[PDB]
Amino acid sequence: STGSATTTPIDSLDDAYITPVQIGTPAQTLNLDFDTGSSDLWVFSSETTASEVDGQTIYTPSKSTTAKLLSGATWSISYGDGSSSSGDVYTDTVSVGGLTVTGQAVESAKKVSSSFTEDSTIDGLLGLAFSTLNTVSPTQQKTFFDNAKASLDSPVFTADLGYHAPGTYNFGFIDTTAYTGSITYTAVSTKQGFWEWTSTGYAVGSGTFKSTSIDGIADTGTTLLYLPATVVSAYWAQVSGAKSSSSVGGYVFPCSATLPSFTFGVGSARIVIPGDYIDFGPISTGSSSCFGGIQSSAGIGINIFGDVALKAAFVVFNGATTPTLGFASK
């Protein structure tokens, strides 16, 4: 089997991407944030505290003939941005782009933190990291990809995120028309539950490439590119007037600037992020200070190849017995 679904930016900045997902019988379509940095499929629901729902579409298990309470199971998750959610668990039929999994754990939110409530465009998350990170207790549950894998033509999914435009998540096949050149594959460590890999270095603009190992995670659920402070300083030093602002929470730059590109290495190959992809617009409405799309990871504990990096590439998440990642230009 295979599946193919379009993913769409939630706003003009590509702050996140939503993909329609069919849950239950008859289908209830919710727009979920596919997140290769986590491993829970959770949704706004008829159980979510009413004051914490503000425009989201909800899953109502009582209206699904295939929903079953997973008795005794609870979940609770906290994300790197400080947001969180928790609740109970149903199993139900879940389909993405024509690919159907029966018996998928659908984690129903009873509580969500303010950032989720305040984002009316995201109805939940669909985790695509390794199932060892799934938070369901006392019986840990499998991701949608893990459940689908055996049925797929090939045990892979691909992320093809757009810049200010829709893109595609494919399951079970590699669309050879969706990228240019060849795909360069690189080793993955699953020791932390992430799609963790080692970039071979970077360049800023037209500058020379610096060969240096940068361990980090391919994370579709993080907006920006978070890299070591040395790398980030070398980038922003090429932008007149750019500075790190403690009050704003990162590097800012004059909105009048033209930003240089940023290149990262994948083995001997190179992925180029155009400068425009690094512009996240005014820090507040009407400001002439703009927020940068490359930020320091120094306070995180891990480097994160988020959407800013991934949307410059066609990315293969290879879930074979030994997982690997593939990157191609496009």
From Swiss-Prot:
Residues 17-328 form the Peptidase A1 domain. It comes from Cryphonectria parasitica. This is Endothiapepsin. The active site is at D35, S199. The gene is EAPA. It catalyses: Hydrolysis of proteins with specificity similar to that of pepsin A, prefers hydrophobic residues at P1 and P1', but does not cleave 14-Ala-|-Leu-15 in the B chain of insulin or Z-Glu-Tyr. Clots milk. GO terms for molecular function: aspartic-type endopeptidase activity. The keyword Protease applies. Keywords: Aspartyl protease, Disulfide bond, Hydrolase, Protease, Signal, Zymogen. Disulfide bonds join C255-C290. It is an enzyme of class 3 (hydrolase). Its EC number is 3.4.23.22. Belongs to the peptidase A1 family. GO terms for biological process: proteolysis.
